[PDB]
Amino acid sequence: HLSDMLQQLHSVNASKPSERGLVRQEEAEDPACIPIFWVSKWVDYSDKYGLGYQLCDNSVGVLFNDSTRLILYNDGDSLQYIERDGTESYLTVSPNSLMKKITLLKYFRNYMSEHLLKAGANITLPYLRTWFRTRSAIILHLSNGSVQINFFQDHTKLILCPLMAAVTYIDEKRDFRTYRLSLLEEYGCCKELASRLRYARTMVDKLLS
């Protein structure tokens, strides 16, 4: 579904959506397309352990440096462990081979409950497949096909879902708006969103590379 979101981004970037006489972004908004999940907080500790993150439902997960993952549901007890090959195991916090990974999940659980800003905090199962950082953004790929790109300098964020063929844009003032990508070609959009959609394309290419 990376290839699907590639064709979706190419289709809108090819229409030059900011280069229109009278742009009308608002006609492309579709609340029904709003994503169920996104990343609300993250901590890059990949020099030692991996990357820890929270999802908007307050569940937490870690993508460990050995490409395994541990996910703790928002009931604080139910666990999922994901091996490198993708094998999924259902655990509870309460096997012994994972005691080291669980005690690191706890560090990240403690961190997320107390420390960072919740992206999308106003608004009311997948795991981090992979991620990377560039000089200007962190790029997060979830197992449900969503791709999230957070931009460091101005805190804007894109959430791309290839299933709804939609993009959610969170701007610097934290305005959360979701758009059908097909309708962005029709009605156009501002230069700031069109720039980030061009960036997303180079980032999905890299995800595909």
Binding site: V39, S40, K41, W42, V43, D44, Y45, S46, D47, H115, L116, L117, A119, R133, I138, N150, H155
Partner: peptide
């Protein structure tokens, strides 16, 4: 290291 917004 690095972290999301504080």
């Amino acid at each position: 290291s690095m972290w999301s917004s504080m």
